[PDB]
């Protein structure tokens with residue numbers, strides 16, 4: 001019998017759900033016999049990324065293009081006829097990203113005591129419940145409620161549980177950025193099946209093999225100041241309407257503000273982050289400070305920037321150590 005609070009136990013079961021991993025694979029139409037959950041390998045996936053890079057290049061740039069599409073399907077077996085377009089190549093990339101974390105999740109799970117407590121320990125994260133009556137819960141609730149975008153109206157968000165999280169070794173890694181100017185509490189959403197990898201390894205940057213297309217500001221860690229922009233990356237459906245979103249303290253420092261896409265390979269010297277300027281910004285006057293970190297929880301208003309490719313802000317760091325994960329929210333998506 002696990003001594004852990006029931007919301008923490010429910011979180012572990014949700015993270016380490018094999019049925020969820022298998023369901024995701026069934027939806028991606030992967031052959032579960034030719035490519036079972038336990039046989040997905042990093043080497044196979046990284047090599048598939050490379051073929052998708054050799055593919056997106058031919059589309060950007062027919063015997064050798066079919067031979068590249070066919071060599072990909074040989075590498076990542078599917079069961080269908082097998083279906084140009086960088087958006088389809090980016091879908092395969094995202095599938096491979098989900099497949100990797102699905103592999104990590106299964107790897108931890110498979111690789112005396114209650115299975116819930118044993119699986120908790122594999123996450124190397126200290127997970128505590130934030131009380132509904134606390135000042136932190138109130139601030140977090142206000143942040144969810146106010147930063148829901150007017151354009152994003154496919155669902156309503158409801159906070160189920162708020163967890164305070166301490167990833168093992170992240171405190172040590174963060175130390176150089178601890179006193180940096182412009183530290184902000186920002187959103188990061190992901191598929192529930194990715195949270196085993198995120199808690200055990202932290203938020204990561206896409207490998208060099210992975211195609212850069214899709215990464216507007218290049219390969220880094222992306223954050224939003226509007227909950228609905230990050231909540232979309234949960235990919236919640238009416239079927240599975242419960243998602244997980246992070247609140248991270250991000251050491252932005254001096255921001256390289258951009259109004260359009262730019263594949264950052266090296267920031268301008270003296271700059272520590274990119275801020276993609278959006279048309280709508282959370283009201284800066286309502287900006288509060290939760291334990292010395294800026295919390296942009298104001299309601300969505302015009303930033304004045306009409307000359308931009310973005311509707312809402314996004315923040316990107318290019319060093320994993322600039323992120324200190326603080327909270328994990330369990331959100332109910334109530335679709336309209």
Ligand SMILES: Cn1ncnc1[C@H]1c2n[nH]c(=O)c3cc(F)cc(c23)N[C@@H]1c1ccc(F)cc1
Pocket residue numbers: 090187188189190213214215216222223224229230231233313314315
């Ligand atoms: C899909 N993905 N994989 C890693 N990071 C992400 C996204 C992302 N995840 N989560 C967020 O909360 C977020 C909040 C933003 F304002 C902006 C974001 C994100 N863009 C990231 C993005 C989008 C498309 C793409 F092709 C590559 C990267």
